[PDB]
């Protein structure tokens, strides 16, 4: 469970970064349309 | 533009799914601390 | 747990709406290109 | 068509993940009701 | 090219969500086995 | 729980297959804009 807890944190961090990256691309893409 | 629009919905779905997932983590941690 | 229940329901409804919208978009895009 | 095909792939993955998420919510609620 | 980029980003997000889902599934299974 | 166990296995296999599909399609799409 200690190892489980660390992995949960790892992938939570990774997805939060990927989501931020995606939000940034989305902003860029939606700007180009305008 | 229609591809860009739908990608916005896919991203929003992923974001809301991540919130759901975090809620499940809280539930599991409550139960785990009690049971173990 | 009451507030947990509320938030689960909130996010579930939001996701289901977003999936439904996306499915409609998907069908329409494929039909257009065909 | 290739981009739209990848959109369909991503949407279907998201749908399958939602079913899994819903199953995890059910399991947590079952365990919670069971103990307390 | 930016659209294909968004698809790569979304796929990566989905893959990280699936690692998360496998962890939450494992955890629920551990607790279910213990109490049922 | 018996039904739950079956559905977990079913959707786990489904997502693994869809992610593989998506990875292949992404390779193809990236080789095409090159």
For residue D32, the chain C residues in CB contact (below 8 A) are 1
For residue C30, the chain D residues in CB contact (below 8 A) are 4, 8
Specify the resolution in Å.
2.1
Minimal Cα–Cα distance from F8 to chain E, Å? 8
In chain C, how many domains are there? 1
Domain that holds residue C18: 1-34
Q: Please give the method by which this entry was determined.
A: X-ray
Minimal Cα–Cα distance from F23 to chain D, Å? 9
The span from the CA of E16 to the CA of F12, in Å, is 14
Angle, helix D2-35 to helix B2-35, in steps of 10 degrees: 20
Minimal Cα–Cα distance from C16 to chain B, Å? 8
What's the N-to-C CA distance of chain B in angstroms? 51
The span from the CA of A14 to the CA of E17, in Å, is 9
The span from the CA of B8 to the CA of A17, in Å, is 17
The DSSP output letter for B31 is H
For residue E10, the chain D residues in CB contact (below 8 A) are 10
């Amino acid at each position: 469970w200690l190892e489980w807890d660390r992995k949960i944190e790892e992938y939570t961090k990774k997805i939060e970064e990927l989501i931020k990256k995606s939000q940034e691309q989305q902003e860029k893409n939606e700007k180009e349309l305008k | 533009s229609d591809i860009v629009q739908q990608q916005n919905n896919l991203l929003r779905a992923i974001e809301a799914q991540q919130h759901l997932l975090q809620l499940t983590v809280w539930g599991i941690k409550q139960l785990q601390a009690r049971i173990l």
